[PDB]
Design a protein around this ligand. Structure first.
Ligand SMILES: CC(C)CN(C[C@@H](O)[C@H](Cc1cc(F)cc(F)c1)NC(=O)O[C@H]1[C@H]2CO[C@H]3OC[C@@H]1[C@H]3C2)S(=O)(=O)c1ccc2nc(NC3CC3)sc2c1
Lengths: 99, 99
């Protein structure tokens, strides 16, 4: 699809057998999802944003389907206020910025 | 231009007579710039992100040239770690997401 930016670019994702909505975020290097139940091993990590830092759990090689496109990569799980799809996955679905 | 997302989508902007670099950010509702000297009158505001909140000064009807495109609108100024061009200005330069 082509997505204009008059509203938030929200998309439906499927991850770990659950359905969620997430923001396509070109300003995010990594993908960060709200607290959710994800199978497998994870490694502790701290990431920084506009207001300071949060601790997250890093899961690698996680399959996500983003608006019908499959991708595999790293997902961070923690107290983000919104689910964010970052550039590590945006590149895999072929997403580009155009103006 | 068409911008792919293997690197941060950084762009050169001119605002308040100064040249800066800023991140094209589809996950940002509003435009937030690092501390900088802007001429107008401002209004205190508080915005939320990944790690909490920061206090910013809001300036309205500020002219910004973004990769050669002119836009006018609200700019928030404060302790963000990165200059962020948000959707209030991305829509004015015709920016879309495509995949
Ligand atoms: C969290 C998003 C949902 C919102 N944000 C934009 C994201 O694009 C940030 C951009 C950013 C990049 C940085 F490098 C550093 C930063 F400080 C900020 N991305 C990020 O936090 O990424 C982080 C983490 C994610 O992976 C890596 O990539 C970068 C790092 C890192 C770990 S925002 O900044 O908080 C924002 C902007 C405008 C705005 N307008 C408002 N208006 C009111 C509602 C009416 S609310 C509001 C909120």
């Amino acid at each position: 699809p082509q997505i204009t930016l008059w509203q938030r670019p929200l998309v439906t994702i499927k991850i770990g057998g659950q359905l969620k909505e997430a923001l396509l975020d070109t300003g995010a290097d990594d993908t960060v999802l709200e607290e959710m139940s994800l199978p497998g091993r994870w490694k502790p990590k701290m990431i920084g944003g506009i207001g300071g830092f949060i601790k997250v759990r890093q899961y690698d090689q996680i399959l996500i389907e983003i608006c019908g496109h499959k991708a595999i990569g790293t997902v961070l799980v923690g107290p983000t206020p919104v689910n964010i799809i970052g550039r590590n996955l945006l590149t895999q679905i072929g997403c580009t910025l155009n103006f």
